[PDB]
Design a protein. Structure first.
Lengths: 511, 511
């Protein structure tokens, strides 16, 4: 049991080192395999797409301070370091939705308080490194056991709603900027309507190709390969559509050529922690701990829940693991990295399972067709190292990246926020609220609890989400991570009195 | 058995009369019921929409000679007469796709041969009446038994393809007329992407609403009501969308006010058979027999097959049938009706099944549940007569019909041509050409015949369709009705030699 209080300082980390690094030769020896070559392209595309789209969003929101070049460099550096000297090489590192929300909230708060956006970031990172060291030294990584399904589903639903809502707003802004009138440019014909066509065309191509994977058409070998290319194909089709129309203006993303620093007129490659243009107030270096705690919660929750999912007994990963070394490495890198600008990164649970699923080799089954035994996972470090290097050497092609319309990306930004709602039991219980009770499916949380006591759980769980959404839209949007972890004590004491022990074994089951 | 050669000249007509007319009182007495009032609005909408859309097509195709007013008047008159003095009033009379194709072909032939378009139509009408009388007097209505599934599926697939192809052509023409350029009107900003948005929006609203009917969401009573409103809701939504945009130009269908004659500057309410402006040639009054035969086949094939489907043993219609009287009434009416302009009409199989479904009464189920026994159908004359009189008094609201965009209608033209492909066994066998043989469904024509002998039948059936489509795209696109019935002799003599008896009982089964 990795999550056990040994009692010695840095005990868990030392145990992770001693049970992981002795195998530093097999991780490089197991590189020679066609499966690795097949997976290195799929995961490379799956990591590049939510790098350019998130960089575009961040460049628009952060007033062209952190753009596409910065996020790509950060992803490349952190991925290379983590894969080279980490403990779970299958765990990919990438920018996430909650981090984007927190960054825009911090930017708004800093703007509405006359401070400098990139000077307080360095102090946030400085406090974050110390906080991570203190948490690792006291063996506090066992707290992940206290986060049940009641919180993860709420958080996932909130993030999906944010993704969905950050696209209709952009459409509304485009129609307000380029109105439909008879005969930043600020008013062009055939621009507000091509944008609507462009992101609707790319959402439906990618949606239907994903639906084509699960279908029974075509041989299984060809169907599986094409199905994995749902997003890369959708971008390629719609870029060629806009390339043919050369007389109409459409907004395109901005990638500086070479190794520039995203409009080098407001920022340099090195940020002065003491002050750039005006003295930094004395009260914003010893009171920069409260924001450091809130950002630490998001990184801790994303990075540790993902390790639980990938280390489940269903997946036969027997080489070692990491629960203390991985957290110390990720958080301490972000604090040092924030000195040079650049954003913080966390582990991505959607891309990590895809990375692992592309490396497992199934067994044979003379028995009727099912999901057979999973012998070996072919775990290694070579596959994850090359991908982080390939994303790094994607800024030399900035000439081709500058031809991608901004509307094409927002179509996928909506696709990623709507196909992420599957598997969320909070989402499935929402359909059951409309279906007649005779049509409900045969699931564990249906037969063991009567329906009137099942809708009360959903209403209580949905009430919390509305309350947390409202906080994020006020002037105190910086404090929403605190409310997120405030639901865990609620389930310990409040739900226990109102719900019997019988109910809270099928609704909250972690299996 | 109505289809039996009695031997007397007008045997079938008198046989139908003496078993249909004596109970004239019951057909009017059975009117008082809420089912009729519920079904009348549904069938009214289902008959009105493919009258305005077909009139919109016909106005453009026929150079504003037969438009929307004429088609509505023809539908109203023929419906009233048929429902008043005809057998089996459950039939719904309406303009069909094959008739539209034939009228377009005849218009092209008349244009490319210096003849007038509405003068030869009257002679075709007289000849059509003569052959209807001759056909009925010789008891030739039993020939419908010789048309098997091999011909009906080909005909349906060809019509659906024509419907689909008559929309992308219109989109291409709009985009060539209103090109995308920087800053009949013949060139306006926007008004080319709006048309693409308008017909894509109305196709998806109607498509998803139909998919909502089969779902398990919502109470059963509410689901079926708004489920039947797939098309009327889709039109209402997209008209309100184009009403808000008042600065952009969108093409709208032309409905003359009052009882005008669709631009009465080139036509009158009466047509001179001997000539309007120039002496009509002597060699198109005795050689209009060939077009009269060809149009007779379409009316004969479409009308009689519909009666068989409605009078199947599954539907408990035992009140009397009209295999003989209906054909004489419909065909002879069109010949007289063509004297006053106006188009020919035939019974519609899609709206006839829907009309019967809306009046049937299911029974209770002691068993766990299936489609129970059908107790009574409530066949009558009042329901069909009111609808024909309600479509007729829809030209007084021509001010409201003039605000419907022409792009909204073509969205439903494509919807009708794609949801009509279900139930066609020729369409279902086309999917099986791509599925792996392990995934084929549990269907009768799958296990009894090996797969390699099943794809030969589909390829032979598909080869005929391509040959029939080729003749329709040439300058001799008038003999395609003749080629259509030429498939029946092919199956009698040619296919039976190459296929064993075992195969031609599951592929060609009529049950």
């Amino acid at each position: 049991d990795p999550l056990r209080r040994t009692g010695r300082p840095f005990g868990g980390l030392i145990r992770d080192v001693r049970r992981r690094y002795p195998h530093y030769l097999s991780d490089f020896r197991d590189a020679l395999d066609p499966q690795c070559l097949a997976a290195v392209i799929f995961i490379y595309f799956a990591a590049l797409s939510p790098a350019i789209t998130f960089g575009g969003l961040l460049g628009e929101k952060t007033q062209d301070l952190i753009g596409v070049s910065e996020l790509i460099m950060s992803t490349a550096l952190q991925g290379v370091v983590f894969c080279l000297l980490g403990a779970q090489p299958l765990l990919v590192i990438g920018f996430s939705g909650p981090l984007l929300v927190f960054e825009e909230a911090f930017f708004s708060f800093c703007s509405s308080n006359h401070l400098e956006y990139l000077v307080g970031r360095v102090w946030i990172g400085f406090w974050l490194v110390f906080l991570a060291l203190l948490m690792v030294a006291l063996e506090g990584s066992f707290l992940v056991r206290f986060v049940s399904r009641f919180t993860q589903e709420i958080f996932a639903f909130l993030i999906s709603l944010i993704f969905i809502y950050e696209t209709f707003y952009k459409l509304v802004k485009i129609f307000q900027e380029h109105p439909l009138h008879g005969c930043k440019p600020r008013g062009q014909p055939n621009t507000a309507l091509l944008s609507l066509v462009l992101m609707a065309g790319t959402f439906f191509i990618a949606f239907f190709l994903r639906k084509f994977k699960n279908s029974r058409f075509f041989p299984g070998r060809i169907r599986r390969v094409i199905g994995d290319f749902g997003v890369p194909i959708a971008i390629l089709i719609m870029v060629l559509v806009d390339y043919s129309i050369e007389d109409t203006y459409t907004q395109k993303l901005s990638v500086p050529s070479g190794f520039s620093v995203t409009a080098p007129e407001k920022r340099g490659w090195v940020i002065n922690p003491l002050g750039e243009k005006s003295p930094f107030p004395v009260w914003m270096m010893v009171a920069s701990l409260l924001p450091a705690i809130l950002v630490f919660i998001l990184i801790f929750m994303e990075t540790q829940i993902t390790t639980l999912i990938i280390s489940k007994k269903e997946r036969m990963l027997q080489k070692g693991s990491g629960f203390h070394l991985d957290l110390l490495l990720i958080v301490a890198m972000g604090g040092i990295c924030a000195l040079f600008g650049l954003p913080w990164l966390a582990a991505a649970t959607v891309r990590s399972v895809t990375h692992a699923n592309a490396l497992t080799v199934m067994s044979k089954a003379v028995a009727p067709g099912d999901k057979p035994k999973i012998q070996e996972v072919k775990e290694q470090r070579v596959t994850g190292l090359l991908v982080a290097l390939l994303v790094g050497l994607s800024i030399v092609i900035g000439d081709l990246l500058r031809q991608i319309p901004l509307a094409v990306l927002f179509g996928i930004f909506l696709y990623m926020g709507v196909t992420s709602l599957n598997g969320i039991q909070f989402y499935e219980r929402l359909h059951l609220l409309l279906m007649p009770p005779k049509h409900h499916p045969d699931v564990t949380y249906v037969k063991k609890v009567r329906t009137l006591r099942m809708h009360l759980f959903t209403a209580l769980q949905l009430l919390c989400l509305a309350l947390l959404w409202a906080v994020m839209s006020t002037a105190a949007s910086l404090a929403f991570p605190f409310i997120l972890i405030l639901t865990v004590p609620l389930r310990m004491v409040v739900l226990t009195r109102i719900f019997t022990d019988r109910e809270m074994k099928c609704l909250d089951a972690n299996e």
